[PDB]
């Protein structure tokens, strides 16, 4: 029955980790997958987290199934993180949150939900975008179309080209936005542009879906939510697929959430009940661990304090790594100018190397980047910075 | 966009959880959802589990993403527990295992895989069956048909009906089987009946799918795997969705596995690549916690010894509650004769109660059972047995 199955091509991201973990080369450098690395080159468990886990070890008394939608407290905290402590969304009880296995699980949950309870047929994703977006949506039976975004010869956000592209989107179409830290470009809309898109989308009748996986890595917690918050003030309905993988260093515990908003309580409850049915036919209930971690920290004043500090440290190192990177490129006598890299934000930088420069960088020097030329700046360290820049310069 | 969404009906199982939580009557009794309770009435965290957890707290240095298929050790152990220590399956390298978020997530992973890579169009589930089977499969765009199973009158396995009904399954159809501890009848075939079924299925051309969620609750780890093992010797291709939720008391951590078997190593490999693609478009990678716990305990001779005893205790306690239940029923007044209950395996007995009788026990005596009349014997304690057998008798 399987005699005919065809071999799938491997994940452009997840697949590279396999090649990586296979070269027996001494000085290999991994700048592919979106992990945060410290000065010493490791991917540490944060301390606030270790503290939270200790607490859990002492205090848990049962492993009793969670409800479909997970931990209440977790949902509450996510909302305020998301909309504000103040908010009317929260005040009017307009939103409902489901804890899912990572922000990947939330995307799928939303897709399954949309495909089965709405008249949605297409979803609009930026170009370029996170490669898994297409697979998730196609998996639910939805079609994906792209909208212009990135201005390659200037490394910018091509606003009108983005807007003109969107004019092709019909009313009732889904349009996907990246909260902040655009993956893989690192180019984000300003607050004005966010406001414009908000208005437009209200006129054109689109349903907004925000992919929020980097809250806190651009400028800060509250200010990273600005774009989302502007949309929220104008819309009656929207979906937020959020992740705690990067901001809590909880990658393998799978912690994310799916937030549903409707014009009002009665509607949202009705709507959510179906979202629940979609979950039940998937993984049933969500994994407690990582989510208990996040709820514990967000719920405790001390731990939260530590956590925020650990987060601000993460963000700053990355910003340091980015200046260090171009300066060194410079000193190493790089052809082009790479100063645009200083303007982007988050873990990734769109380097501008070609398919075959990245292919070369790898076969030849053990430097691992994603085919699109996306580079993980958080994987860079003062110790690997020269060898790195020396390889790049050698291929350009 | 969400204005016309209709409210979903509640889950026969999970839904009761909700009502239970909200019921304020003091002496309530829960015999709904499949959770193991102790003499004192709690869902405790096993000792071997708390140990393994301590070990993790101390030894973990990273939260790094696991791979699509999870922790290699986990899969290795799972295959041994499943096929036995030195199986040819393991030796020939025919099976491949993916770690999933519970047995639920394994079921779904298999459905998505099947629906997309094979020409499978329909799935055969027993009557009666675990309510969620239907939903998972339908979600994948698969048809679910039913096969005769239980004989209500003499409360037993009707082999002819079972056999005669399958007679309509076509070649290339999936036939789903319960490893042991039939949910919800508690009626399992004999080894001899297992052997018969194993021959038909081959002759007839079916693709067997085993739902294995109660390994260890019938007779023992190995004994419990017989039917599966007999199937494994004749078949070329097989699917296994297993759960560690009940045998490890790890309910909310979501630990399960999906094992894919092919005629050979190359085929299975090729096939598994697709299964992996299906997972990437779903939740990406699995939750580390509970799986780490399982691998830790299975790979350490000492922790393993403790666990197997903990598990033996569970099974034993349950069988005690069985006989206590009938005796008390009788000596307390019952009209009917519930002795058939002594011959079922697992957490659950099919009580023979009416939809009206279960509604009533709920509404009137605070006793929670599932509408089909399935009761959780493992939710019964020596302290609640009195008031319980009284409620029942009063509705007879
Ligand atoms: C990492 C990432 C995701 C998926 O997040 P997980 O929490 O790892 O499932 C989704 N979208 C973007 C833009 C991401 O960077
Ligand atoms: C419990 C159970 C499952 C799913 O269990 P998980 O909690 O997701 O591991 C599947 N099938 C049967 C028959 C079960 O009893």
Swiss-Prot record, chains A, B:
Gene Ontology, cellular component aspect: cytoplasm; cytosol
Protein name: Aspartate aminotransferase
Effect on the protein of changing residue 374 to A: Reduces first-order rate constant about 10000-fold
Pfam families attached to this UniProt entry: Aminotran_1_2
Description of how the protein assembles with itself and partners: Homodimer.
Enzyme class: transferase
NCBIfam families: PRK09257.1
EC number(s) from the headed UniProt entry: 2.6.1.1
Cofactor: pyridoxal 5'-phosphate
Organism listed in the record: Escherichia coli (strain K12)
Induction comment: Transcription is increased specifically in response to 2,4,6-trinitrotoluene (TNT) and its indicator compounds 1,3-DNB, 2,4-DNT, and 2,6-DNT.
Entry binding sites for L-aspartate: 34, 130, 183, 374
Gene: aspC
Sites of N6-(pyridoxal phosphate)lysine modification: 246
Similarity field: Belongs to the class-I pyridoxal-phosphate-dependent aminotransferase family.
InterPro entries reported in the protein's UniProt record: Aminotransferase_I/II_large (IPR004839), Asp_trans (IPR000796), NHTrfase_class1_PyrdxlP-BS (IPR004838), PyrdxlP-dep_Trfase (IPR015424), PyrdxlP-dep_Trfase_major (IPR015421), PyrdxlP-dep_Trfase_small (IPR015422)
Biotechnology: Has been used to construct a 2,4,6-trinitrotoluene (TNT) biosensor strain.
GO biological process terms held by the UniProt record: L-phenylalanine biosynthetic process; L-phenylalanine biosynthetic process from chorismate via phenylpyruvate
Effect of residue 133 to N: Decreases to 60% in maximum rate of the overall reactions in both directions
Keywords: Aminotransferase, Cytoplasm, Pyridoxal phosphate, Transferase
Catalysed reactions listed for this entry: L-aspartate + 2-oxoglutarate = oxaloacetate + L-glutamate
Record's subcellular location: Cytoplasm
One function term, GO molecular function aspect: L-tyrosine-2-oxoglutarate transaminase activity
